[model samples]
Target chain A: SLTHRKFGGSGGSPFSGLSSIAVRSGSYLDAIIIDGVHHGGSGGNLSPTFTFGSGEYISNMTIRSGDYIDNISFETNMGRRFGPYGGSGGSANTLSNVKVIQINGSAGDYLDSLDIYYEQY
Target chain B: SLTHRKFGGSGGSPFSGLSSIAVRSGSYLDAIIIDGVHHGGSGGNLSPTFTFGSGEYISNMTIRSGDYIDNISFETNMGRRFGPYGGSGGSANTLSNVKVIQINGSAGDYLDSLDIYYEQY
Candidate 1:
């Protein structure tokens, strides 16, 4: 049989953001797909991004393709803070095959693809 | 400036998997996120997976977090084949920060995280 679940939370501030997937032990799998097309905001502000904490495991995925006016970034705490108003946790887990496609814009001038910041642990 | 876009495709074998994101020129952003939690299979089978073509650009993303039996895979049209009845392609593009978190199972028994198949196009 097949099982599927979707966890989503949105808040004005990071303090209000929710944490859904949290694994303690045993092998696990978590896939997060973001739609920058639908999740767009005004100003140069960021959207309600998701954080894959230190204990979490993430895998193969793609982001932003073909013409975008908004940006979605992914990061791991590289000596940054945590919880609302803080950056993402460090990259203590395994990651591979992650890419951001650039479409309809200039290079390095706009937030059009996926951005990731991580510190080796 | 900030921009974003998302595309999706799914088929019975390979001919059916939809092709959503396709960029020709100019910098663009395309992010595709899939949830093994929500997208699972049955009878020890696979689910509707996504494929990143040669011209597509993808970036920093995560998949499958904790405890899963079903599998969600990602591949490119390597040398095996294309269109259908073929393996993923070669990794002709740039990919990084991509990880598949295995949850709830032995080291390698079930399909819990993201699987990537590519060639050096």
Candidate 2:
């Protein structure tokens, strides 16, 4: 079992590294909650990565931002795989209540705001 | 002066456009608020545009989503210009309490998530 992280604009990772609330052996859950502003450097590079393990459960999370280079990535290899680069591991988790606002910057650079990966159940 | 926009998933523009809440003779403000999920096309295309006027004001907003192709564009021409594509109009407003979650999909395509523009004030 895991708890949630409370983040503000001035403190903590606005990117939200990774969080898990609860889970079982055959399932997993991941949740993230952020409320503030984040900014990436040149090339519009902002890193706020999160990783999930097998049989993990995450929930009840919120992420809010006013402006910043926002990006969330889920790595498949980090989880579990079945048969030939895959395994009968836990199912990929989910996300909710993620929002961005007043994002001021380049258009092309603002495209890749949120990214995710999961195994078909 | 102007008010704020309250947004939710499966509702209006997840990509909030220009909004004015309050402004003076030589100033302006814009704000957007959203909460829910947003999904783009095959090429990961989501449309949420906003525009602002001179001496406008916008504020207090929130945007929340579970997963979606998010894009916010601000056209300079839509605003005001003083000299040579420049002006002393109001400054470009801002965004707050915007969040996203469980975004699952490709990587490079998830680049342009949020975009904005404003006259240097």
Candidate 3:
């Protein structure tokens, strides 16, 4: 069994399903916006929009991180890939075969930390 | 095996997890809103808002329905209950041990139809 704190975004807002996502980044993740809500600071350039058609969903996420989110990528059920968007720094991690529902973390000039909420699809 | 169309909200937006919900209804559900987005029509009186506290997640939903969503109820991981909000009519159905992520359907003067997306937590 896991406690609530073990889950990312467990202490954050309610989860909504994914639709489209946009990320902005410089040396670190400047901002990550899911659906329409924007999180993080104003520093990075925006990446191309990651849009989901009807019936499409995220299958995995590859995130490069240390103190801040260095880079990130998204893989879809339709086998589509969305980024690796940000700077080259830190270690890489992946969340596979899940639909990310919410993201929460501390942010200031850059994304200081990130936590995600997800479910097996 | 099930297809995408067999799933509720499969044709709708990316799912985010639940946090707060509110429904308005007359003899039929006039409106339903999850988080901040409003679905359905503007006709019925608003019910009390269902809010989630920290580390809490929804575990089940009991929905009463006919041509329109007659009533609805929600249960949480924290064992809290919200609603059964609406009139008394139609059959009752339950989605148990799942986190409702997205809600989709068609609505006019009342909720014409309703669909939901959920994942096992």
Candidate 4:
């Protein structure tokens, strides 16, 4: 917001930080997990609005294997580049390869990243 | 280090940031993914290095369901908080609920936040 944190301007991450989550229980299959991340209701790269889909890949969603992310709020204060995982606008360059989740695995509008509410079995 | 910026003491997240990624195809099931995010290299909540574990739950990894994260780099600058998901120490307070994944969901350290190199399906 300072100017959209500069992002590729390279080097910058400042913060106030997040404020939420513990997740529910009983059957929190975690069907694609990411309990929360907000504040970028409007900011850089549009701020904290990371998204991904194509039928939620990670091979039918890792089937109990691997894939994770804890935070994402970049900032140098040009305004905010918050997320600092994997560089370039950080949060892994707005995320990587969208080749496919599986055949017939195509969804939509990935931005504003996932927020599933935690539920699966 | 700017005195490790408070954290619960409260406030700060600035960064040098991250780089590198471009997951491969052919079968990048993304089993426990995360191409990169290194800069915490040696800093705050230990800085840039996010970690998670416990037989990689998420209910057998959300079985093509829903669960995901992009980056976890907090900001404010105490050396680095680098994660901005839910809240507290951000990236949603390191992470949440480790109730259970399943019968054979027993593994080890699930963090420094995944980096599977890519493979599955």
lDDT of each: 0.23, 0.22, 0.64, 0.19
Q: List, for all models, the DockQ compared with the true complex.
A: 0.02, 0.03, 0.07, 0.02
TM-score of every candidate relative to the true structure = 0.19, 0.16, 0.57, 0.15
Task: Please provide, for model 1 over A1-121, each residue's C-alpha lDDT reduced to its tens digit, 9 standing for 90 to 100.
Answer: 1121221112111110112221111111111223222211232323244444333422232232232212112333333222122123222222233322222211222223222321112
Off by over 4 Å in 2: A1-48, A65-107, A111-121, B1-121
lDDT tens readout by residue for model 4, A1-121: 0000111111122111111111111111111112232111121232233333112222111111112222222222123232232222212222222211111000111111222111112
Leading candidate by DockQ = 3
* Tens digits of per-residue lDDT for model 2, B32-89: 1222122112232222332234323232222121121122222233342211111133
lDDT per residue for candidate 3 within B1-121, as digits (tens), equals: 1112111111112322345678888776777766555656788798878766755667888777776678878898889998878888878877777865445455555665554655555
Question: Residue B46's C-alpha lDDT in candidate 2?
Answer: 24
For residues B33-113, what per-residue lDDT tens digits would candidate 4 score against the true structure?
A: 122322112212322333232112111111111122222332221232322321122122222222111110111121122
Between the candidate structures 2 and 3, which one is better when assessed by lDDT?
Answer: 3
Prediction 4: B-chain TM-score: 0.16
Question: Quality of candidate 3's docking, in CAPRI categories?
Answer: incorrect
RMSD of 3: 10.0
Model 3: residue B93 alpha-carbon error in angstroms: 8.5
Model 4 CA lDDT for position A6: 10
User: Which number leads on lDDT?
Assistant: 3
By TM-score, how accurate is candidate 3?
0.57
CAPRI-wise, candidate 1 is incorrect
